[PDB]
Design a protein around this ligand. Structure first.
Ligand SMILES: OC[C@H]1O[C@@H](OC[C@H]2O[C@@H](O)[C@@H](O)[C@@H](O)[C@@H]2O)[C@H](O)[C@@H](O)[C@H]1O
Ligand SMILES: OC[C@H]1O[C@@H](OC[C@H]2O[C@@H](O)[C@H](O)[C@@H](O)[C@@H]2O)[C@H](O)[C@@H](O)[C@H]1O
Ligand SMILES: [Mg+2]
Ligand SMILES: [Mg+2]
Ligand SMILES: [Mg+2]
Ligand SMILES: [Mg+2]
Ligand SMILES: [Mg+2]
Ligand SMILES: [Mg+2]
Ligand SMILES: [Mg+2]
Ligand SMILES: [Mg+2]
Ligand code: NA
Ligand code: NA
Ligand code: NA
Ligand code: NA
Ligand code: NA
Ligand code: NA
Lengths: 1011, 204, 193
């Protein structure tokens, strides 16, 4: 039958979907969520053999172990065991588009397991097996006899094995197809893998059993009273002595309990459901659930007889909360949310798409620690434990059906086709049936990037009808279609419109007010964190705070999807698209996370944490006004620390307890501040510290900060007259200056400082020269490729203009002696194909103090693309252990991504000054720096800099960080000006005008002196 | 034009139509009908079937049609005649002045139904005046109400032709048969004959 | 596979639905709705045998006429030819309510037709068969080979026979089940045929 090439057959013999079950046979174990003896894990060592196609699988395999098989751990993706290569393609399908067929060469994973079954499970009741995740389709046999078939790689498939098992040893055989008609609905931008990659379990239920239960919580107008309603369905023979009790617990206190026999209310002319019952429990003053305070109760559903004998019990955590949209705003418990969200794929660099509790917990903690309160399940239902963790730690969740057909042309070709309505419907309905009792799920999503088709409208309405408690969203077809309750664009910019035909991406501020529009807008994906990115992130947050109906978004995305590979010596390195011989591929576009694959943060995470802070501040005189953006909790685990420093030197500090109600304000008067005895700028820094540990943070955690400049006292103090006058030595070839044991050499043909000595030690490996280019970031490159240039990308604009090929031509180089110093004057032009791109004019003034003051005045032709930077660079001869500067930090920061950095005196090891992006580029800059110290050198001015062992040339010629090698000495780039990095998206120019170097004439000045 | 979906015998009547596992089979009954008949001018309204309660599958399918063909209203009587799956209040056998307040699915007087709180839709009975045997008493009362009330826009009489079948006696002569006449059992006897005309088209 | 007891399989290999087509090769014929030589009727006399369950049908029937069959007119309802009784039930289903299963004694009508196809239809293009109404579900074979399956007794089921036919005589075999999971959706108050 080739069921895997027929969207009309998405399963055979599969049991109905339902919420998480454990069939406890003791109510207290169900209350406490303890492991149940009736739910067994079959995870562990299985037998596996790979075949190139299902036709190649031997019939002997059904009956007995293939000797060629290997023993492997399950769950797993077979690519992570090396059986075949994982493929990274973004939009283009990994197979020829010819639905519903798949390639004849279709990798097939034959897994099998010999295991025991106790006669107690077979003598009575039902034994089923549950495959939480099989990618992409599979046939199942038990003891050589065929059981069934399933599709949808992201929801559990369950089959009744009662009639197939025998007491003692049994053997399962599972044939997993990599490709199937289900693959047409699984074109998400991620690695394409396969296998039994989530848990496999055995569940025993009694013949008379709870087959489903739904929990709803409705409230009065001020949330001071609630009704918990639990609808329970059974399977088995109905008997008048059967009963259901539903009890609700708050910790160890029983809050409410109700019992009834089966028999629901009349529904229509034929009666009601004799096999169901609805229990209603009143709850006074319920503790409400939110991400701020995830209060939970426990609901235990017992199926029993009238005499009291328990048949079985099921249970769930319950969070009392209402989600609704009113008057254009998404409210939670009646208050408008501000979603500090992030999209998160299920990805591990070693295990592929298999998820474990430890990584999930790691992710949740880093998210909360970084001021995130929500997560979107991009783009499929997640492993079941994820929802339990979000319920208990507190994160709002968008649960999303596993439907993405991005690669079709047009994108809605299948979703507007009624023949694909059945397959799509199962991906939506079975997700709702599984997850509808989790309080953390607040919004349902119909999938991702599948255009807008009539099937979406049908499924939108199905959800609305079955579960009115949660809004439904969906971005395809323009982000504001009739299939979504929230305008939920991806990568729409704050102020700039992108009027694409048919599916324009308006500025978000404008979108809200289009004629007739009234819905809330929450971006389903925004600020693409690929490489050195997040430029402009603050612009989104300023808009979300100013516009009520802009209720936030989900950053794209949490974690880079890089995979580990090992080199010749066994050392690991991070790989991306194409690194497994996969082709076609989309190279580094699989790495868009705020964190690297191993969970180390990229510098962009701190920018997100700061802009997503829950306390806002204003200063007026001595007064700091703290405003709380919490909706529900008081600031009961926070104090404000303040510190005043003059140019990095601390002068005063204190701490004050914070007691701010949700949305309230607190005024804090700072004490009178003694005047500083010295020139310099006083800076005030405040930080919000949580003194006590929580379930998600350690004592001392810093959750918010802000700085302000206070008084400045400009220096008017005439230096101090020099003990000596430098000497100028002129030769045909050079101008040399000597002072004490120092010497500087200016080559007269190049017009640059080519060497500097301390004693007899040379300090430069390469001359000090202007630099107008950067090793291109992912955002500068976009989708441009050698094979297919995008002439609009910044890197191609700069290449084409000759920025990377231009050579300095000398126009002037003179030397003069002044009363106490020597002055070198130079002028250079940079040209390409006979056009002058840039003109740099400088003076170097070396005085009796040994300081060399450099003034730079640059002209940039108006018609050349605005340059990446305007600075100087050199390769220093020496290497030093530390870098110390007075400027913004401590982490990497760029003009359009420097809000989180603070002005202070920072000191880091040199390697911390390099950011190891997997695809190397310009990195490590720190802006707003007034003083930089390295070795015996010191540079003073108002500049941006980076310093590392890798030249820009090397960074730009190297595609993987593991292949970089430290060069001799230290490369120093010191910029008077540097372009923004952008990141609203990484496929079209996204640096805002205000961060482009378009002024035409630029001036900067620096002093280089010795320490 | 009405989809071939009727699950009247289920208990409750929407047991299958509220079950998502039956959504695919129901979907094809509706979508394949619209794909076949949507160019006929005579079809002015689509119906989702008959006597199958009101289930979420109906709401999904109602919306599908509204999306694919906005040119025609969609009606469906199941679940009370005025659910979210119908653009027209389309009761069967609701009386002119007399209410029949059955639980869950009352059959109001049609004049009263139009004005229930918040109601604004037109009302056209999907079935009214059951012409079984010597019947049609009270027909005029419907017509007087349809002409007086703008929003009472008529209805479809139940029904056109008796479903009697011909059998032959021992002498070979034909006779009209009804339920149970073929040994069929259980059967509902003469309830299959409700038409304004006899099976041979002779008028009653 | 017992496809007739699985609401997840309502068809196999069926073509998409669409409005009435006739494939005219003359535009003036299309303007006036004249008969089209490309749309042929297969109505008329066919071969038919009745069995009490699909399990009873002999395999020989797929490749050869059953001598015991009768010649009957199609379209027709087999109860009207006296092979079994029509049933008049209003609301109560005519079969036990146990979805999606149906009775094991499930009246099966085995229809077949030997018919000619001209080479011109097979040299180029697509030849499909269209069953406007088959109650309640059926499997179709052509020249002994299985083609597909369909449900919904009141809409046309169409199958591409291009790869199954040959010039000259061909034989269709259609196994029609009286009861199927589609019966659960066909409980109208009328005779059950
Ligand atoms: O992380 C990659 C990112 O790709 C996104 O799609 C990018 C494409 O967008 C099209 O609309 C087109 O404008 C192209 O120029 C561009 O390559 C996708 O939208 C995101 O979901 C994400 O996969
Ligand atoms: O021509 C018969 C007529 O019956 C109608 O149903 C009659 C009555 O029968 C009971 O068995 C039902 O439970 C009850 O609700 C129903 O009203 C049916 O509505 C009509 O469509 C028609 O078949
Ligand atoms: Mg399939
Ligand atoms: Mg995509
Ligand atoms: Mg490529
Ligand atoms: Mg009777
Ligand atoms: Mg079927
Ligand atoms: Mg002709
Ligand atoms: Mg021949
Ligand atoms: Mg009926
Ligand atoms: Na807002
Ligand atoms: Na990506
Ligand atoms: Na506090
Ligand atoms: Na690079
Ligand atoms: Na009227
Ligand atoms: Na009747």
């Amino acid at each position: 039958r080739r069921d895997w090439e027929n969207p009309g057959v998405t399963q055979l013999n599969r049991l109905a979907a339902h919420p998480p079950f454990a069939s406890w046979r003791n109510s207290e174990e169900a209350r406490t969520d303890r492991p149940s003896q009736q739910l067994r894990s079959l995870n562990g060592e299985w037998r596996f053999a790979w075949f190139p196609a299902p036709e190649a699988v031997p019939e002997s395999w059904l009956e007995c172990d293939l000797p060629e098989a290997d023993t492997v751990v399950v769950p797993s993706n077979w690519q992570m065991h090396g059986y075949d290569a994982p493929i990274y393609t973004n939009v283009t399908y990994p197979i020829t588009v010819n639905p519903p067929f798949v390639p004849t060469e279709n990798p097939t994973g034959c897994y099998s397991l010999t295991f025991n079954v106790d006669e107690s499970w077979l003598q009575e009741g039902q034994t089923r097996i549950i495959f939480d995740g099989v990618n992409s389709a599979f046939h199942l046999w038990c003891n050589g006899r065929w059981v069934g078939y399933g599709q949808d790689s992201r929801l559990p498939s369950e089959f009744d094995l009662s009639a197939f098992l025998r007491a003692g040893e049994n053997r399962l055989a599972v044939m997993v197809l990599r490709w199937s008609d289900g693959s047409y609905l699984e074109d998400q931008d991620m690695w394409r893998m396969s296998g039994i990659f989530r848990d496999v379990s055995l569940l025993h239920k009694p013949t008379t059993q709870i087959s489903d239960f739904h929990v709803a919580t409705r409230f009065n107008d001020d949330f001071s009273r609630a009704v918990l309603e639990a609808e329970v369905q059974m399977c088995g023979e109905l008997r008048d002595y059967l009963r259901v009790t539903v009890s609700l617990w708050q910790g160890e206190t029983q809050v409410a309990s109700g019992t009834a026999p089966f028999g629901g209310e009349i529904i229509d002319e034929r009666g009601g459901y004799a096999d169901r019952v609805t229990l209603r429990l009143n709850v006074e003053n319920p503790k409400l659930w939110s991400a701020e305070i995830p209060n939970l109760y426990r609901a235990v559903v017992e199926l029993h007889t009238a005499d009291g004998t328990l048949i079985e019990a099921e249970a769930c955590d319950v969070g009392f909360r209402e989600v609704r949209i009113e008057n254009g705003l998404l409210l939670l418990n009646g208050k408008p949310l501000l979603i500090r969200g992030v999209n998160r794929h299920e990805h591990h660099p070693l295990h592929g798409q298999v998820m474990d509790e430890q990584t999930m917990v790691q992710d949740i903690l880093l998210m909360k620690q970084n001021n995130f309160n929500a997560v979107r399940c991009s783009h499929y239902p997640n492993h079941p434990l994820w929802y339990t963790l979000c319920d208990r730690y507190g994160l709002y969740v968008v649960d999303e059906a596993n439907i993405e057909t991005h690669g079709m042309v047009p994108m809605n070709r299948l979703t507007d086709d009624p023949r694909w309505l059945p397959a799509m419907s199962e991906r939506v309905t079975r997700m709702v049936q599984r997850d509808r009792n989790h309080p953390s799920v607040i919004i349902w999503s119909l999938g991702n990037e599948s255009g807008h088709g009539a099937n979406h409208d049908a499924l939108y309405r199905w959800i609305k009808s079955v579960d009115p408690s949660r809004p439904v969203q969906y971005e395809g077809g323009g982000a504001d279609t009739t299939a979504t309750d929230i305008i939920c664009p991806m990568y729409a910019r704050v102020d700039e419109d992108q009027p694409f035909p048919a599916v324009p991406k308006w500025s978000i501020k404008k979108w809200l007010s289009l004629p007739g529009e009234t819905r809330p807008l929450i971006l389903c994906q925004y600020a693409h964190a690929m490489g050195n990115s997040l430029g402009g992130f603050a612009k989104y947050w300023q808009a979300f705070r100013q516009y009520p109906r802009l209720q936030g978004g989900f950053v794209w995305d949490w974690v880079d999807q890089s995979l580990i590979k090992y080199d010749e010596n066994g050392n690991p390195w991070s790989a991306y698209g194409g690194d497994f011989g996969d082709t076609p591929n989309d190279r580094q576009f699989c790495m868009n996370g705020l964190v690297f694959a191993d969970r180390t943060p990229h510098p962009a995470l701190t920018e997100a944490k700061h802009q997503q802070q829950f306390f806002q501040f204003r200063l007026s005189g001595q007064t700091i006004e703290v405003t709380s953006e919490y909706l529900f909790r008081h600031s009961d685990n926070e104090l404000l620390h303040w510190m005043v420093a003059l140019d990095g030197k601390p002068l005063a500090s204190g701490e004050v307890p914070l007691d701010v109600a949700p949305q309230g304000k607190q005024l804090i008067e700072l004490p009178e501040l003694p005047q500083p005895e010295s020139a310099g700028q006083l800076w005030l820094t405040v930080r919000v510290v949580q003194p006590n540990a929580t379930a998600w943070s350690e004592a001392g955690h810093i959750s918010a900060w802000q700085q302000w400049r206070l008084a400045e006292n400009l220096s008017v103090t005439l230096p101090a007259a020099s003990h000596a006058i430098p000497h100028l030595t002129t030769s045909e070839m050079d101008f040399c200056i000597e002072l004490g044991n120092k010497r500087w050499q200016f080559n007269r043909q190049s017009g640059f400082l080519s060497q500097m000595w301390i004693g007899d030690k040379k300090q430069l490996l390469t001359p000090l020269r202007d630099q107008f280019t950067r090793a291109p970031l992912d955002n500068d490159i976009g989708v441009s490729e050698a094979t297919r240039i995008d002439p609009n990308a910044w890197v191609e604009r700069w290449k084409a203009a000759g920025h990377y090929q231009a050579e300095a031509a000398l126009l002037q180089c003179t030397a003069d002696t002044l009363a106490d110093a020597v002055l070198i004057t130079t002028a250079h032009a940079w040209q390409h194909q006979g056009k002058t791109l840039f003109i740099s004019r400088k003076t170097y003034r070396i005085d009796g103090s040994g300081q060399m003051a450099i003034t730079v005045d640059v002209e940039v032709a108006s018609d050349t693309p605005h340059p990446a930077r305007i600075g100087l660079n050199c390769q220093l001869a020496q290497v030093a252990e530390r870098v110390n500067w007075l400027g913004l930090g401590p982490q990497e920061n760029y003009p359009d991504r420097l809000t989180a950095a603070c002005f202070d005196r920072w000191d880091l090891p040199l390697s911390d000054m390099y950011t190891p992006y997997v695809f190397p580029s310009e990195n490590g800059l720190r802006c707003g720096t007034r003083e930089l110290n390295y070795g015996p050198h010191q540079w003073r001015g108002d500049f941006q800099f980076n310093i590392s062992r890798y030249s820009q040339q090397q960074l730009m010629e190297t595609s993987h960080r593991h292949l970089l090698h430290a060069e001799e000495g230290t490369w120093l780039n010191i910029d008077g000006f540097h372009m923004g990095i952008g990141g609203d998206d990484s496929w079209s120019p996204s640096v805002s005008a205000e961060f482009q170097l378009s002024a035409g004439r630029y001036h900067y000045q620096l002093v280089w002196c010795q320490k």
